[PDB]
Design a protein around this ligand. Structure first.
Ligand SMILES: [Zn+2]
Ligand SMILES: [Zn+2]
Ligand SMILES: [Zn+2]
Lengths: 267, 49, 97, 111, 48, 64, 213, 178, 294
C-alpha cells in the first residue's frame, strides 16, 4: 500500500477551494479514464459524413485517409474532473503534431463526440487506438491514482502561549512519486512525508530514511497499544543504516559483511 | 431493552439496504457502493453490540 | 460471512439475502442459545482465528530468529560507543544519552 | 454480429475499393465480395453495460431458492414475481434489484 | 564412460544435491547422505 | 528479422548430428536448412508459426 | 501558461543553486540571494518569454571564514546548459572553457538527461571537479526538509582530532554513498568527514559523524 | 457406485435429442444435459424431464445415490453417478400445488408406526422409507438448488416475550418461502 | 498383528472444467484445467489445460492456447479444431459460441482466427500437431499424421469416447470449454471455488486398493512376460504355477498397508504417505473418530 501524505501551506490549509484545486491539479488523469466509447467509421467524403447524429455538427464546424476514429466521452466524468474540450484537444495536438486531425463538439450537445482522421491501414487504426489508450495523458502527476482530502488536528501554540487544536487540510495520494509531487506549486515542499523508505533514500537521503523507518516502526508497534523503548528502535534503524544504503534483514544484506566466515555460515 | 436495541439495529440495517438498493446511499471517499455499505453495516452492528 | 453457496451463505436462506441473520450476526448470547446457523458461523470464525494464530506464530518466530541473527554481536564498550565485532561504530552513544 | 461467406464458409474482411470508393466485405480464401450496409467497422465500449439485463430465462420461476416480492407487473398485473441482484460480476456493480414476473417475463427496477 | 562415472561418484561423495541430474540412491531407495547435507539443515552439524 | 538457429538434428546425407542450421525469414516466408559438414542447402516455404522441426520434417518428406 | 511555470521552476532552481553555493562556503551577495521573480523575468526572459541559460552563468569566490577553515576552496563557476541532450559536442566545449579560465570547481546542470557516453568524460578532467545535476532535482531544496538535518563539512584538523580521540581507523565510521543527494549537495569527496546535529527525543541535541566514500 | 447406462437409456426413452440434431440458430433456448461430466444432448422442455427423473428416483427405479442437479440460471442438467460423493438424507416436503399435503411433511405417524412395528399392514427399516418417497439423499451440488428448513415448526407460521430463552430469527426479507 | 485402518483421501473431481485466474507477473489471464478419468476403474489418465494469453492492455494478440497430453508446446484452439474435423471458421464459431448478438466474444476470438489462418485443411494441421507431440526424427508425413491422429483420439478427453468415428462430441466439448472460458474472462461469471465440496471426492479403501491391485497386476504381468521370454526357447511346457509368483502382490500389499507408502517399494519418493495408520485403541470415542477420518 504505497501512499504519500502531502501537507499544504498555511494560507492553503484553511481554504477548501484552493485545496480542491490542488487536489485536482495533482490527481493523474489520462484519456482512457475519460473515454466512454470508441468507434471506427468509413467516411469517403472528407467534407461530409454518413452518420446523421454528427451531421449538423460538422456542417456548422466546416463552415486524407477515409477511416475516421470517433470517440465519445462521458459527460459526468468530464464534468467532475473539471476538464473541457479545448484542453483535451490541445493536449492531443501537442503530441500528435499534424499527423492526426481533431474535431471536437460543443458541450451543449447530447453527446461529447471527438472525430479524428489520419492525414493496409485496417490494423493500423486499431494499433493507433491502443497506443492512444495507454500513453495519452491529460494532466496530473504520473503515479497518483486516487487522492483523499484528510483533516489533520495539530497542536499549535496560540498567541498567548497555550496549545490549541487546529484543523488543517492535507492530502493522501495513492502511489509513490515524491520527486514530482514536491515540485508542485502550492505544496509544502519541506514537510511532505512518504511511507516508502526506498524512494526516500533516493530523494532526500539516509538521514531522512532513518527517521522514516523509525516512524514506521513506532507506528506499527503502537497501533496495537504496545510500547517499546526508543533505544531499541534507534539501534535497529541505525544498524540497517550503517553502510550508507538500506541493508535488508535477509541473507543478502547480512551475509554481505566483512565479518568472520564461521559467523556468516551460522545463518 | 436489549431486544429493542437489536430490533432498532435491524431496522437501521434494513433502511441502509433500502437506500443502497435505490441509489440513495452516500458514497464513501475511496470506497465503492458495496464496500461502503458493508462498512456501514459492520459499524452499525458493532455500535449496537 | 462470504457467499459460499450460490448468492447465499447457507441453503436455509434465499438468494441475494443481505440480512444480518444471513451474514453472520449472532443475535442470541451464550446463555440464551445459539441457532444452528449462528453456531456454524461461530465455529467458522473460531477455526479461522485458530488457523491464523497457528500460521502467524511461525512467521513471528522466523522474524524473531532473523532479528536475533542480525543483532547478536552488538556490545557497548567502555568508551560509551556502540560497536559490533568488526569495530564499526553504529551509534556514538547508546540510546543517544 | 459478424457474418461469414456462403460459399467456402469463412469470415469476411472490410476493404476499400478505390476505383468506386466504397466499403465492401471480401473474403481471403476465395473471390467473393459483397456490399457493406453499415459504415461502422470496430467499436470498443470502455464504460460498457452489456451483461446486466441480457440473460433472461423462462424457467426462472421454477427455482424455489429465489425470493418473491409483491410488485405489480406493468403488463398482466400479477402478484407473483421474483427478484434478484445484478448478475454482473464487476467490482463496481450496482446493488439495484431486478424483478421478473411469471407471465410476460419483464425486467424492471425500483427507480 | 568410466571417467565420467568416477567424476560423478566423486561429485556425489561431497554433494548429492546437484541440479540437472538425478541424485545417487542407495540399495533401499533413499539417497546417499553426502557431506554437504550433514552440515546444512535443522539436524545438521552446526545447527544441531 | 531473420532467425538463425542451431538445431540438434542429423543430416540426411553425411549422417552428422548437431550440425543443422535453420535460417527462417518471415518477411518472405522462406526457411533454409544448411549442413556444417557436407555443405548442402534445402529451401522450403514456411509460415508465421513455423519451427525448425517443421522444416526438418518437410526435408525428410522431400528426401523420401 | 506553461512559460510562466517554466520560468518559475527555472527561478526556483537558480535559488536552490545559490543556496547550495552559499552553504559550501562561497561568498554570495545579499542582493542576489534575495532576488525577486519580476526582476528575474525582466533580466532573463527575452521579448517572447524564452529564457537564456547562457545569461545565468556566474562565478563565486570563497568567504574569508571558509578560506580560514578550508584551505582547498577555490573559485566556483556555475553554468547552465542550453541544449537539452548533452552530448560529446557540448562536453568538449565545457571542458575547454573550464581548463581555459583555470576554474577550480564547475557545477554542470542539464535539462533532460545525459547520455552514458558523456558520463565517462567527467573523471578525465582531473584535477578539476565537475558535478552534474538535473534541473527537476534542483526545483526543491532538500536541505530545508524537516527530516533532513544540517550537515557541516569537517576540516582535516577536526577529523584528525576526532580520530585521535576515538582511536579508530577511517573504515570504522558510518559511511555514506557519493550518489546521495545530501552528499552531492555539499560536493563531498572520498575521505571527508561530515558532522550532523540532529534532534533526539531522549536527550535533545545529538551529534553524529559520517564519512563519504 | 452406479452405472450410467440405465440413466442414458431412460434419457433416450423420455425424449433426449442427440448431438447431431443440435444447432444454436434453432436451439437458442434448450437446456444441455451432462452425465458424469460428458455432454450427452439437449432438451427443449426440461421442466417435465427433471420432474419425471425426480419421481423415478423417489419411486425406486433409480438408485438413491444418483445426484440430479438443475442449474436454471446457467441452463444445465447434471446427473452425477460417480463414486465418492458425500451425501446426506433429508425429508421430502410436498411442493406441488395440486393436493392438500402442500406445506407439510410427506412422512406421517403411519410410517413411524410401521418402523416401530417392523412390518407392513398388508423387513421394514430405513431402506423402506427411502424407497417409499419421504427421505431422499442430497450431496453438496444438489444442495445448491434446494430450500431446506431447520425445524419442522418453521414450516408453518406461528401466532412469547420470554427474557430467558433464545430469540428466533425474524426472516422478513422474503414475503413467502417455498 | 497390528490393526491398520485406511484413511480416506480428499481429491478433486474428474471430468469437470475448473477455471482460475493467474497473478499479475504472467502473460496468462485465465486457465481452464480438467483432469480426465475413465469411468471404469476410476483411475487418472491425463490433464488438459487451456490458457488465455494477454494481460490488461498488454500482449498485443489475446489468443487462447491448449496443452495436449504428451506435448512440448502450446497449440491454439483453431489448429486443433481444424485438425479434429471442422475446418471452416463458420462451423467452429457456431460450435463455440451460441450468441450472435454479443460482439465482445467475437472481438476476443478474432485474434485466434487471425493467428490460425495459415492452416486451411486437416492434413497440415495434423502434421503440425504431431511435430509437437514428442515425436522423434524419421517418422515422415505418412506416419506423423497417423501418430497425431492416435494422440488426438486417445489421451485427449478419454471420458467422452475412445472408438473411431466420434469426433463431433470432442469438438462440441472443446467448443463448450472455450465458451465457458470466454464467459469467465468477460467478467460475466465468477471463478470456480476450489473449496467447494460439490467438486470434491473422498477416495476410501475401494479406489485406492483398486489402483494398488492394478499396479501389482501390471507388475506381475511384466514378470510373467519376462519369465515366458526365457521358458519358451527351451521348447518345454511350463507348469503354469511355476510362472506365477504369489509373493510379489502379497509383499506389496503388506508393505503398503504397514508402512503407508502408496506405490512400489523402490519408489518411496514422490508418493503419498500416511494412507494406512495405526488404529488408536485408547477408548471407544477415539476408535469411532479414527474410523471416520479424511
Ligand atoms: Zn471465401
Ligand atoms: Zn406478468
Ligand atoms: Zn551433412
Amino acid at each position: 500500500t504505497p501512499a504519500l501524505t502531502v501537507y499544504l501551506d498555511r494560507e492553503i490549509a484553511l481554504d477548501i477551494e484552493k485545496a480542491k484545486v490542488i487536489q485536482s491539479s495533482i490527481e493523474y488523469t489520462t484519456l482512457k479514464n475519460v473515454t466512454s466509447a470508441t468507434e471506427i467509421y468509413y467516411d469517403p467524403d472528407p467534407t461530409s459524413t454518413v452518420i446523421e447524429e454528427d451531421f449538423d455538427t460538422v456542417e456548422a464546424y466546416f463552415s486524407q485517409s477515409p477511416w475516421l476514429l470517433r470517440l465519445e466521452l462521458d459527460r459526468a466524468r468530464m464534468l467532475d474532473k473539471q476538464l473541457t474540450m479545448n484542453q483535451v484537444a490541445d493536449k492531443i495536438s501537442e503530441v500528435f503534431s499534424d499527423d492526426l486531425f481533431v474535431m471536437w463538439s460543443e458541450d451543449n450537445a447530447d453527446k461529447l463526440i471527438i472525430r479524428c482522421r489520419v492525414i493496409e491501414e485496417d490494423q493500423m487504426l486499431k494499433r493507433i487506438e491502443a497506443h492512444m489508450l495507454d500513453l495519452i495523458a491529460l494532466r496530473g502527476i504520473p503515479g497518483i491514482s486516487k487522492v483523499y482530502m484528510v483533516k489533520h488536528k495539530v497542536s499549535v501554540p496560540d498567541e498567548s502561549g497555550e496549545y490549541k487544536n487546529e484543523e488543517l487540510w492535507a492530502l493522501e495520494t495513492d502511489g509513490i512519486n515524491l520527486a514530482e509531487v514536491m515540485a508542485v506549486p502550492g505544496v509544502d515542499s519541506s514537510r511532505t512525508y512518504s511511507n516508502s523508505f526506498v524512494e526516500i533514500l533516493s530523494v532526500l537521503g539516509i538521514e531522512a530514511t532513518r527517521s522514516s523507518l523509525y516512524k514506521e516502526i513506532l507506528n506499527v508497534i503502537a497501533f496495537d497499544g504496545s510500547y517499546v523503548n526508543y533505544r531499541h528502535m534507534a539501534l535497529l534503524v541505525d544498524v540497517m543504516t550503517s553502510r550508507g544504503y538500506l541493508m535488508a534483514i535477509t541473507r543478502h544484506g547480512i551475509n554481505r559483511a566483512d565479518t568472520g566466515a564461521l559467523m556468516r555460515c551460522s545463518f | 431493552e436489549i431486544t429493542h436495541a437489536i430490533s432498532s439495529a435491524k431496522e437501521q440495517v434494513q433502511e441502509i439496504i433500502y437506500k443502497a438498493q435505490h441509489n440513495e446511499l452516500e458514497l464513501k471517499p475511496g470506497m465503492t457502493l458495496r464496500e461502503s455499505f458493508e462498512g456501514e453495516v459492520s459499524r452499525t452492528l458493532n455500535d449496537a453490540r | 460471512i462470504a457467499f459460499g453457496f450460490a448468492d447465499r451463505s447457507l441453503p436455509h436462506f434465499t438468494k441475494d439475502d443481505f440480512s444480518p441473520e444471513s451474514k453472520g450476526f449472532v443475535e442470541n448470547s451464550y446463555l440464551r442459545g445459539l441457532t444452528p446457523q449462528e453456531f456454524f458461523f461461530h465455529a467458522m470464525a473460531g477455526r479461522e482465528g485458530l488457523i491464523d494464530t497457528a500460521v502467524k506464530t511461525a512467521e513471528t518466530g522466523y522474524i524473531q530468529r532473523r532479528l536475533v541473527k542480525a543483532l547478536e554481536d552488538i556490545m557497548v564498550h567502555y568508551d560509551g560507543t556502540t560497536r559490533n565485532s568488526l569495530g564499526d561504530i553504529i551509534q556514538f552513544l547508546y540510546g543517544e544519552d | 454480429s459478424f457474418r461469414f461467406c456462403l460459399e467456402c464458409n469463412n469470415m469476411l474482411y472490410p476493404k476499400e475499393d478505390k476505383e468506386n470508393q466504397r466499403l465492401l466485405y471480401s473474403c481471403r480464401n476465395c473471390d467473393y465480395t459483397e456490399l457493406a450496409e453499415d459504415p461502422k467497422v470496430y467499436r470498443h465500449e470502455l464504460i460498457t453495460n452489456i451483461g446486466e439485463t441480457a440473460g433472461i430465462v423462462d424457467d426462472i420461476g421454477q427455482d424455489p431458492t429465489l425470493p418473491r416480492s409483491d410488485k405489480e407487473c406493468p403488463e398482466c398485473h400479477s402478484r407473483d414475481c421474483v427478484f434478484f441482484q445484478s448478475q454482473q460480476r464487476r467490482k463496481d456493480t450496482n446493488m439495484t434489484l431486478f424483478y421478473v414476473c411469471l407471465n410476460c417475463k419483464k425486467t424492471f427496477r425500483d427507480e | 564412460e568410466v571417467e565420467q562415472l568416477l567424476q560423478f561418484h566423486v561429485a556425489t561423495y561431497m554433494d548429492n544435491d546437484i541440479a540437472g541430474q538425478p541424485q545417487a540412491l542407495q540399495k533401499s531407495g533413499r539417497p546417499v547422505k553426502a557431506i554437504r547435507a550433514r552440515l546444512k539443515g535443522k539436524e545438521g552439524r552446526l545447527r544441531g | 528479422i531473420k532467425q538463425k538457429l542451431e538445431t540438434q538434428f542429423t543430416c540426411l546425407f553425411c549422417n552428422h548430428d548437431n550440425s543443422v542450421v535453420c535460417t527462417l525469414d518471415k518477411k518472405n516466408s522462406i526457411g533454409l536448412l544448411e549442413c556444417k559438414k557436407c555443405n548442402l542447402s534445402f529451401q522450403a516455404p514456411i509460415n508465421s508459426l513455423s519451427q525448425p522441426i517443421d522444416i526438418y520434417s518437410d526435408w525428410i518428406d522431400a528426401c523420401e | 501558461e506553461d512559460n510562466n511555470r517554466i520560468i518559475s521552476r527555472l527561478w526556483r532552481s537558480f535559488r536552490t543553486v545559490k543556496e547550495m553555493a552559499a552553504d559550501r562556503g562561497y561568498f554570495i551577495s545579499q542582493e542576489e540571494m534575495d532576488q525577486s521573480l519580476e526582476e528575474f523575468r525582466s533580466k532573463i526572459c527575452d521579448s517572447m518569454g524564452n529564457p537564456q541559460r547562457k545569461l545565468m552563468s556566474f562565478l563565486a569566490n570563497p568567504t574569508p571564514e571558509a578560506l580560514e577553515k578550508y584551505s582547498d576552496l577555490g573559485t566556483l563557476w556555475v553554468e547552465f546548459c542550453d541544449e537539452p541532450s548533452v552530448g560529446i559536442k557540448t562536453m568538449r566545449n565545457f571542458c575547454l572553457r573550464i581548463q581555459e579560465k583555470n576554474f577550480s570547481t564547475g557545477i554542470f546542470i542539464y535539462q533532460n538527461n545525459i547520455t552514458p557516453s558523456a558520463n565517462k568524460m567527467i573523471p578525465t578532467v582531473s584535477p578539476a571537479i565537475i558535478e552534474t545535476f538535473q534541473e527537476s532535482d534542483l526545483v526543491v531544496n532538500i536541505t530545508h526538509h524537516e527530516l533532513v538535518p544540517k550537515h557541516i563539512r569537517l576540516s582535516d584538523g577536526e577529523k584528525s582530532q576526532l580520530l585521535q580521540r576515538y582511536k579508530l581507523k577511517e573504515s570504522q565510521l558510518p559511511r555514506i554513498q557519493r550518489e546521495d543527494p545530501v552528499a552531492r549537495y555539499l560536493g563531498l569527496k572520498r575521505g571527508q568527514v561530515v558532522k550532523i546535529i540532529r534532534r533526539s527525543e531522549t536527550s535533545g541535541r545529538y551529534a553524529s559523524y559520517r564519512i563519504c566514500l | 457406485g452406479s452405472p450410467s447406462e440405465p440413466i442414458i437409456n431412460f434419457l433416450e426413452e423420455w425424449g433426449m435429442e442427440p448431438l447431431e440434431d443440435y444447432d444454436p440458430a434453432q436451439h437458442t433456448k434448450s437446456t444441455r444435459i451432462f452425465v458424469n461430466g460428458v455432454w450427452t444432448g439437449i432438451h427443449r422442455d426440461p421442466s417435465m424431464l427433471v420432474s419425471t427423473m425426480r419421481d423415478l428416483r423417489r419411486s425406486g427405479a433409480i438408485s438413491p445415490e444418483v445426484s440430479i442437479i438443475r442449474d436454471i440460471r446457467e441452463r444445465e442438467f447434471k446427473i452425477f453417478t460417480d463414486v465418492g460423493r458425500v451425501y446426506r438424507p433429508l425429508f421430502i416436503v410436498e411442493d406441488d400445488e395440486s393436493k392438500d399435503n402442500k406445506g407439510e411433511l410427506r412422512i406421517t405417524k403411519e410410517h413411524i408406526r410401521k418402523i416401530q412395528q417392523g412390518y407392513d399392514d398388508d423387513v421394514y427399516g430405513w431402506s423402506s422409507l427411502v424407497t417409499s418417497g419421504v427421505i431422499e439423499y442430497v450431496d453438496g451440488e444438489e444442495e445448491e438448488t434446494i430450500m431446506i428448513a431447520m425445524t419442522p415448526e418453521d414450516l408453518q407460521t406461528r401466532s412469547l416475550n420470554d427474557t430467558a430463552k433464545r430469540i428466533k430469527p425474524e426472516m422478513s426479507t422474503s414475503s413467502h418461502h417455498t | 498383528g497390528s490393526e491398520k485402518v485406511l484413511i480416506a483421501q480428499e481429491r478433486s473431481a474428474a471430468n469437470i472444467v475448473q477455471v482460475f485466474k493467474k497473478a499479475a507477473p504472467s502473460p496468462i489471464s485465465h486457465v481452464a484445467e480438467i483432469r480426465s478419468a475413465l469411468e471404469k476403474g476410476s483411475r487418472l489418465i491425463s490433464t488438459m489445460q487451456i490458457k488465455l494469453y494477454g494481460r490488461e492492455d498488454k500482449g498485443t494478440g489475446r489468443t487462447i492456447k491448449a496443452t495436449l497430453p504428451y506435448v512440448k508446446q502450446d497449440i491454439p484452439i483453431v489448429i486443433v479444431f481444424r485438425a479434429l474435423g471442422v475446418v471452416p471458421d463458420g462451423e467452429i464459431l457456431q460450435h463455440i459460441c451460441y450468441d450472435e448478438n454479443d460482439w465482445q466474444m467475437l472481438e476476443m476470438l478474432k485474434p485466434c482466427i487471425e493467428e490460425g489462418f495459415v492452416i486451411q485443411d486437416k492434413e497440415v494441421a495434423l502434421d503440425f500437431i504431431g511435430r509437437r507431440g514428442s515425436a522423434a526424427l524419421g517418422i515422415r508425413r505418412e506416419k506423423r499424421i497417423q501418430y497425431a491422429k492416435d494422440i488426438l483420439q486417445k489421451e485427449l478427453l478419454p471420458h467422452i469416447t475412445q472408438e473411431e468415428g466420434f469426433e463431433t462430441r470432442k469438438t462440441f466439448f472443446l467448443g463448450y470449454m472455450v465458451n465457458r472460458l470466454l464467459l469467465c474472462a468477460l467478467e460475466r461469471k465468477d471463478q470456480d471455488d476450489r473449496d467447494h465440496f460439490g467438486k470434491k471426492r473422498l477416495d476410501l479403501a475401494g479406489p485406492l486398493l483398486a489402483n494398488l491391485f492394478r499396479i501389482l497386476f501390471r507388475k506381475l504381468t511384466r514378470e510373467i512376460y519376462r519369465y515366458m521370454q526365457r521358458c519358451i526357447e527351451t521348447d518345454r511346457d511350463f507348469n503354469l504355477n511355476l510362472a506365477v509368483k504369489s509373493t510379489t502382490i502379497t509383499s506389496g500389499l503388506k508393505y503398503s498397508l504397514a508402512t503407508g507408502n502408496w506405490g512400489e517399494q523402490k519408489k518411496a519418493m514422490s508418493s503419498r504417505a500416511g494412507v494406512s495408520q495405526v488404529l488408536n485403541r485408547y477408548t471407544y470415542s477415539s476408535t469411532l473418530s479414527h474410523l471416520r477420518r479424511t
